[PDB]
Homo-oligomer: A and B are copies of this chain.
Amino acid sequence: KAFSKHIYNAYLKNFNMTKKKARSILTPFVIHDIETLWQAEKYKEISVHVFYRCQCTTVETVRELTEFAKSIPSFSSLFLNDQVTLLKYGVHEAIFAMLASIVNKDGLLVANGSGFVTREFLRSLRKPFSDIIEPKFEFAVKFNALELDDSDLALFIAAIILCGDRPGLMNVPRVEAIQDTILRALEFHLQANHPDAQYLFPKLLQKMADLRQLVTEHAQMMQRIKKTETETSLHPLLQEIYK
């Protein structure tokens, strides 16, 4: 409860764009095509260009999630090396869980909420830049059906970072014990914050396995791009993660 307050507080300190802020906008400049895209920017091609904007957004979200993890209690007392592994395998599951907050069925907020880019447009991109995008929308649309708010998400995101099964963890039991607290606070929080909704906690535990699968298939698609899109550059911060 206090613990949940504190993670919420940390979430607010660290993420410029909260679901709260995002929902109030979604109910910005549309970008539904080439002309609109080009106007918004007022190079290789439109697709690789959109991909570079994805990369720019992911990079920044890694930075935020990195500062955020510093506030999850005991995270800072893990081996430095365990910290890095937790961040490495988890940031993308967190990044895709938080994507739901800025997405609706028709598209997503960009540039701090000033823009909206239609899901139509992103589908129009040539393969495989279309295929790496659309599966996130399918996930985000369902996730949003759970109607979580920011306070819930702050715990959700922390539970994802503190996952016991990452490859190469030295102290699994310690990481697991921190997560178990996070998961307990989260159950407690959902009872209190969503008391008439029913079965939310284990629906959320399932979403965590849905994301793990989503990031598997994303990593899968990224390495295909790493080869087949010979001329497409990848931010070095994103090279370590995919290494």
Contact = CB atoms under 8 A, between A and B. Distances in A.
Contact of A73 (B74, B164, B170): B170
Contact of A173 (B3, B76, B169): B76
A2 B79 contact: yes
A112 interface: no
A36 interface: no
Nearest to A171: B73
A164 B178 CA distance: 17
A79 B173 CA distance: 15
A3 B40 CA distance: 52
A168 interface: yes
Contact of A171 (B74, B79, B172, B177): B74
A96 B76 CA distance: 31
B170 A181 contact: yes
Contacts of A79: 2-3
A77 interface: yes
Interface in A63-89: 73-74, 76-77, 79
Nearest to A177: B168
A169 B74 CA distance: 8
Interface string A134-177: 00000000000000000000000000000010001111110001
A76 to B, nearest CB: 6
Contacts of A3: 79, 170
Interface in A92-123: none
A173 B168 CA distance: 11
Interface in A36-84: 73-74, 76-77, 79
A187 to B, nearest CB: 17
A77 to B, nearest CB: 4
Nearest to A70: B173
A181 B74 CA distance: 21
Contacts of A171: 73-74
Contacts of A172: 73-74, 76-77
10 contacts: A3-B79, A73-B170, A73-B171, A74-B172, A77-B164, A77-B172, A77-B173, A168-B177, A170-B178, A170-B181
Given A73-B170, A77-B173, A170-B181, 10 more contacts: A2-B79, A3-B79, A3-B170, A73-B171, A73-B172, A73-B173, A74-B172, A76-B172, A77-B164, A77-B172
